[PDB]
Design a protein around this ligand. Sequence first.
Ligand code: G6P
Ligand code: G6P
Ligand code: G6P
Ligand code: G6P
Ligand code: MG
Ligand code: MG
Lengths: 483, 483, 483, 483
Amino acid sequence: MSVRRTKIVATLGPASNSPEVLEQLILAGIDVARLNFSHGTPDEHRARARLVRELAAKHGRFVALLGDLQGPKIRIAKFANKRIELQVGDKFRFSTSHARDAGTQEVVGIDYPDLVKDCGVGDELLLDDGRVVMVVEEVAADELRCRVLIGGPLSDHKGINRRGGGLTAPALTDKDKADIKLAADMDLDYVAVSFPRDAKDMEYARRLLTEAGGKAWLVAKIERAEAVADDDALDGLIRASDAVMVARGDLGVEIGDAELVGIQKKIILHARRNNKVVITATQMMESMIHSPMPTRAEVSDVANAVLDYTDAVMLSAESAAGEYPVEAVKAMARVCQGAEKHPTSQKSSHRLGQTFDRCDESIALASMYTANHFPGIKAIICLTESGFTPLIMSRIRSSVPIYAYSPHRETQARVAMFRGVETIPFDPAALPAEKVSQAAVDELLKRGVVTKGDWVILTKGDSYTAQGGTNTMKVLHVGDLLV
Amino acid sequence: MSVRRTKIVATLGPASNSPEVLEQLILAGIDVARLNFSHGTPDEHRARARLVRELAAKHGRFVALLGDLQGPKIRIAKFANKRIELQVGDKFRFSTSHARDAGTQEVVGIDYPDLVKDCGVGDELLLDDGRVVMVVEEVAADELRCRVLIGGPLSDHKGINRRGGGLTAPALTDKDKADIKLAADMDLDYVAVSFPRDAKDMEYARRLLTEAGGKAWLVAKIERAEAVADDDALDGLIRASDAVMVARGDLGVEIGDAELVGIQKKIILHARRNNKVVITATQMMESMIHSPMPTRAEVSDVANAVLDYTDAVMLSAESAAGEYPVEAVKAMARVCQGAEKHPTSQKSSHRLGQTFDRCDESIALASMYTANHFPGIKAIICLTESGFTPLIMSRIRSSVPIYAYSPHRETQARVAMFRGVETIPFDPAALPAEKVSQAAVDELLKRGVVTKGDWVILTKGDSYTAQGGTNTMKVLHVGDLLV
Amino acid sequence: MSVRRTKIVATLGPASNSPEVLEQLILAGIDVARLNFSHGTPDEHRARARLVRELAAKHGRFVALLGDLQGPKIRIAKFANKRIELQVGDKFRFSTSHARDAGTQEVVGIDYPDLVKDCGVGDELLLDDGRVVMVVEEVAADELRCRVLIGGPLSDHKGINRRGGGLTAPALTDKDKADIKLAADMDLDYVAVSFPRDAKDMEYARRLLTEAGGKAWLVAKIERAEAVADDDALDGLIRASDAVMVARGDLGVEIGDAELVGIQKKIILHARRNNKVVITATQMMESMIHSPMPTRAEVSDVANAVLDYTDAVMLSAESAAGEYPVEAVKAMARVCQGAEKHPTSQKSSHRLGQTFDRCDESIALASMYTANHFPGIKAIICLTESGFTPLIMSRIRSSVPIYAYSPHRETQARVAMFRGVETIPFDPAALPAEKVSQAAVDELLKRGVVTKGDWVILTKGDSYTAQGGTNTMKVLHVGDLLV
Amino acid sequence: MSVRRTKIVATLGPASNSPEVLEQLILAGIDVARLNFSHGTPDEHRARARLVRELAAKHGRFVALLGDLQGPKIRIAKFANKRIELQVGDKFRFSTSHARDAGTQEVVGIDYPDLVKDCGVGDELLLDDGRVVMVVEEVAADELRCRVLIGGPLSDHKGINRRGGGLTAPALTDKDKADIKLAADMDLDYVAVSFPRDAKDMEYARRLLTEAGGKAWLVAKIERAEAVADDDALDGLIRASDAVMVARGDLGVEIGDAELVGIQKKIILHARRNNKVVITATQMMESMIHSPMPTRAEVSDVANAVLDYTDAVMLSAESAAGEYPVEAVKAMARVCQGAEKHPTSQKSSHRLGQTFDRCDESIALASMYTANHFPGIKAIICLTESGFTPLIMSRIRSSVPIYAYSPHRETQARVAMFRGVETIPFDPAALPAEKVSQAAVDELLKRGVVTKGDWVILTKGDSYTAQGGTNTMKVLHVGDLLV
Ligand SMILES: O=P(O)(O)OC[C@H]1O[C@H](O)[C@H](O)[C@@H](O)[C@@H]1O
Ligand SMILES: O=P(O)(O)OC[C@H]1O[C@H](O)[C@H](O)[C@@H](O)[C@@H]1O
Ligand SMILES: O=P(O)(O)OC[C@H]1O[C@H](O)[C@H](O)[C@@H](O)[C@@H]1O
Ligand SMILES: O=P(O)(O)OC[C@H]1O[C@H](O)[C@H](O)[C@@H](O)[C@@H]1O
Ligand SMILES: [Mg+2]
Ligand SMILES: [Mg+2]
């Protein structure tokens, strides 16, 4: 089998907090560790962040760190005895005037006044990611009086949303502003914004991140009905980001699970067309929380995401809280490898008939065209400062390995989420100009990726100091004297 | 929202044995009831068969009955209680001599004489489609003594295989020969053959079925590595059948779960190209055994099967043994409807450039072409004897309703598994020839499917008595005087 | 070789006026005789019209008659001596005020009052169908002072036009109004309008033709720069007609020879898209005026028109005035047959993805689809009243013979210009309804077009009296008992 | 309009022998002068060759010289009185036994032993390039007895051929071997072989040319039925050549005029696929022998050759013997420019799905891909030694100017026949390496082809001395500091 191209995002948590498990996850092949700021303390995150970077370096791997902002997720308050159980037909109330610590079998408090204002009789409310469902029977100034449609347990601080969406909330909370600073302070590679509705929400988050001196790239989580209402809404949000996440948990609540299949495919495609990275997420291997093997549906879900040409697939509870975090990563990685053998994973239309905007864009596209048609080419050596050039290369369907050669750590980590891209640390400026090409080829010969007789593509610009000036494509024969 | 086109196969069992639940399944929209002959007594099947047909007729629905032969897959015997639970590290024994009804927590019997010959110390055994895994620690003359590697439940007649591959029975079992007679005696609409390897296995089954006077159509279950080894193997097996099933449980064990995605798609496509019906099966909504809603992976799995253009999707334990059989069917039906709104579900290339063989094939194809391009057409009235004509129509991607008008019950049930086809009972021979067209159009006007001003396609042959002579296509305006 | 599908229009004149030559032209395969009203007396036309119809009937052929209106010719006045000769660089003047009777080597008069208003310095003037070319050097109050660009002879009443057009003239002259009546009186099948500018000119001609009781179909000659200025101009003119003619003589003068290739292709395509007939004309085999074989350029020109999917190709002086009218028709017919063997002549996209408007349109399209894919089909029996149904069929690329079965003479002749359509005289209303199918099939068996074992398509409507109700397509096996 | 891309080959002769006319032809835009060795003396050719090269240099143009070998004619013997005249309907005989000097009004001898074997009753025989045509009425053991179909004169040693071809003769005659030496001695850029049958004939010609020290590229004239008998025959002959010519005069005789259109298109396409140059020839503007303007058929013929994507179009008698050689070239050039504006002239599929063989091939293809999609690119600077790299570039449909930068005269002339390629004399080896790019860009700035702000593609290899090592593509912004 070939080296896996689709990247794996693994959420960390109680089940993946020790050095022994993190080491095993690194070895199993995680490419990105997600730190969910909805839970844990700042120091818990710092400790994990330090440990993943240490253990990655220990094994010559490049793992990005993604920080996930909680967002304006609306939660219930606490219960007196920490949890309750509800049956179909039971009556239940959400009250702004009920004490936050005194939840009972009949009522719980909520610290969000506009919840009651935005809801009306008939609205369906979904709690704990849809596990419990209620319908609003009566509205008063301070509470919603409901009937349970689908029973189950309820416990402190569980999430609530309305079927259809449309709830008022700010995109950035005060917690999120603090977490943005925390992310900048930890030098996180990616930061994910929850529940954005339009480009403004992402621009605001970008402002705050730069103001805090953060260099992270921004991920827009597509979880709101308004974000997918039409192509302009979606494309606007995508263009304001560096990456997007198909956040199927909250999105499914907002638009209905029966609409997910079409929207997942649209989001991935529109992301790639706008030269952004895309992640597919949520319940991809849920059964592995309690089982050491996935279901056939789970295998199919992941494989189909790979054929949709997602950059990465994500684990949440499977890796953060479940009994088999390492086995989940292993299984996910194996399914990705299998799906990548399909003929549709390697054949491209190469954006025929379209208009290119930039010069560096053109060299990237020209290289993918060349590599996909001259099969003697076994690798692409992309000398890059910020990772932009191999971002463009990896938007094109191919099975050729793309190597991002960079001296910077920021870049070496960034590309870990790019489908088909591997990092090779390399500093061309600190070498005699005439020796750069053979030096780059040496790095692949060391690793056994290419041998004498194979061909390779090298891309670069004129200087080795500025960014955004890729303008050259060379096709080199491994074995020849390379200038 | 439009009428669902993708068909639902629901396996019956303990959870779906009563008249109250079967009535609810019929109302929830099942199109085919599967009777798994691996479990239950002949009279249990007869009782369920009678009840489904009665309850379907009660609600003006046409539900086929599919009988699933156990096949030469090797199974364990019964337990004293029905089931046990095993933990990692537990010891367990498979014995040729142990009583077949007295299985315990420590040993179960097995009707496989070569057990000790085929297995050896170190071999891994897989039970229940890989869910439980054991390693052989000791071999004796009549038993295998094992340690559990992966725990889980075990129950009567669960499948067992060896990781190398050496468990199997040769060609059609004696049980199956008896069940073929039982199927013929019950007038089953479909019969499924397990573990077929090539056209010969299906021809043998067809011989036995016709010898017993059975009119059922044959379903080849694709579960053996040899059946998908190459296109000739697969196409041979498909051509010898009337329908095929993507049996992902056993198939995943035989070829590995990482290869399923590509093969599922190939099987569906090759089936449709050879004008056969295709079912996708196994663990599509497994979490609904214990939960009243599916996971996102399960939603995705089903939806993607619909976009692959499967005829039907299947439930096994979800409907047969689980806690929420009705909710599973409802959920599956809702996901199908959502996926059918996708633009790829309705647009066809119409087999351009290909060569047709038959005349009735040509009229079917010509009607789908016409309907897909003249949007005034709201339905296709296909007068058919055996259901062959609407079989061909439904191989072509479309969203136009196909109505199979037939006088025969055999046909009225058969087409229940055809994607996009609805039955309208109708006897053209018992009418004055000049009144047939308006009589057929009346049936759709009664049901509110078409109104005055809509157009319709009618297909038929010259006589109303023979089969295989469809040769006419008419385009009629609802409102006009129809000859 | 197969029966030629592309139709041949042959202009009559002095070289093709006798019964012996007309008989030879009929036998050589002409499908339409063009009567150019620019020359000849009314009785000369009547005599030829009668003779072609007589001789066609004598040999079981269906030849249409097309009457070509002269239109608005702008001409110079007379020269004092009979003819003058000009050399490149010579000076020459056109004067509104000079005496029209005697012209000199330096100046000629002209009956064009707007001359000085319409023309300007730099304009190129083309005389005698482009044979002489001049450029306007100076404009004075009553004359244009020119330099000769291309020399040659000039004589009394030669035509003059301006590169670009914009000379004022009505499309219908008083002569043309008289000729429209003459055409109606002769029962001409087609009438061609010269120099129309827009749909209004064609609607006016249609009014006059119906007022005179004429049943002819109208041909718009695309000869004016204004007619091809943009798609709306062209499409408007096409939609107002039944057929169009790529009139490359005058059109080349108006837009320049270097623009012809693109516009010829556009006109043909837009005509077919709007379900109109199209003729390609002018100098297709000019060398055959004086030679018994065509040049390779002439062969190429005709063949390329056939691959552009023109309905017909035309001869003008080659058949009307030249030394080898019969040999020209024979050569043209042979080149058509050769080009029709090309793979692009028989393969169609079948208007996939498009939206159909009418029901009879749908049956026509459905038949071409069916015939192009079921190769057992050797003919299409199209029962038609007015020829509309086979008009639509013949817009689709195919090599299957289309037979227009009609009782009417108007229709039997009309379809002679339709590519791939042959007339079979037939009256279904005068037969017992149940015997029609086999009666139609008999007509093809008589002619040896189909034999026992071949298949055929029959199209018709419900009654045999009304027009515009084709709604049925049947596929029949020649040899079976046909109802 | 833009600069013409399709190249013009003009045959020289009595009408184009003077310095005044040659100068006018150079200024009118000829790209290649053809020296037909069938006529003229060695010194007549030398004088013309010297004059075209002198006059081209005088006007900064690069005109190749093509030498056309006469090849094999089969000829009749002598007449008693040197010539006779034959009329339509006359009887005439060709006899293998009749005295070779005593030809009469009724019979002539012939030194063709297989005459009776090769010809048969019904065959048409063409003498003196088609001036006389006969049909064979009877065959006897030593003669063919014929009827004259087309009359004319006959004289000693006139050529004879059969419709259908198949007469035995070797591709290279003794005259041709002498002319190969003459071509080498004159340093001709191209040599054309007449009536080759297969790769062997072209390899033999290449041997003789190299043996004589000739550097010319070889043109295979496709005129023999055997050369187009199937794809292997044709492709074999193409692969053994550098260029091919669609020789429609002799080819039409050998396969029939009705087959030319399809074969012209096949030859052009197969030539381009195998990376060869292709010329379309013969009677493209024949009427211009005696007229100063072409017919519409001639305009169409040339334009359609341009849309078929021929590299060049040729004139023979139009430029060599006719009354208007300069006007013919001007007209041909104008028609080419018009046809090049068509949208199909600029859009390419870019050999999607295909497999490339070489590295320099890959850079050429990658540049055409890049140029066709980044419209900021206004030119391609191709540094080439032998012209191979811009040969490959020009196989791809585009409207971007391709500039072949070369120091060698051999190369500067060679590319004159390549569609869309212009020569820029340039010696990169004689410059400081760091100044090459801006030096090349200066050459285009001098000529006003590009301005500040435009982009350009530059291709090259590592050294500036070896051939066959193009391996680099750069995209440069005109105005920036170019390394
Ligand atoms: O745009 P980026 O990929 O960030 O890379 C940009 C840079 O990469 C190259 O290897 C060199 O460092 C520069 O020549 C170029 O400008
Ligand atoms: O649809 P099939 O099973 O091929 O049978 C086709 C039959 O359908 C109906 O009975 C039609 O009215 C008959 O004319 C035809 O023979
Ligand atoms: O082809 P059209 O001119 O529309 O006429 C179509 C007509 O042809 C059929 O043979 C019958 O005559 C009618 O059923 C029909 O109306
Ligand atoms: O296109 P070709 O004939 O192979 O010539 C291309 C060759 O010459 C040019 O000077 C290039 O700069 C060389 O580096 C290359 O090897
Ligand atoms: Mg099975
Ligand atoms: Mg020749």
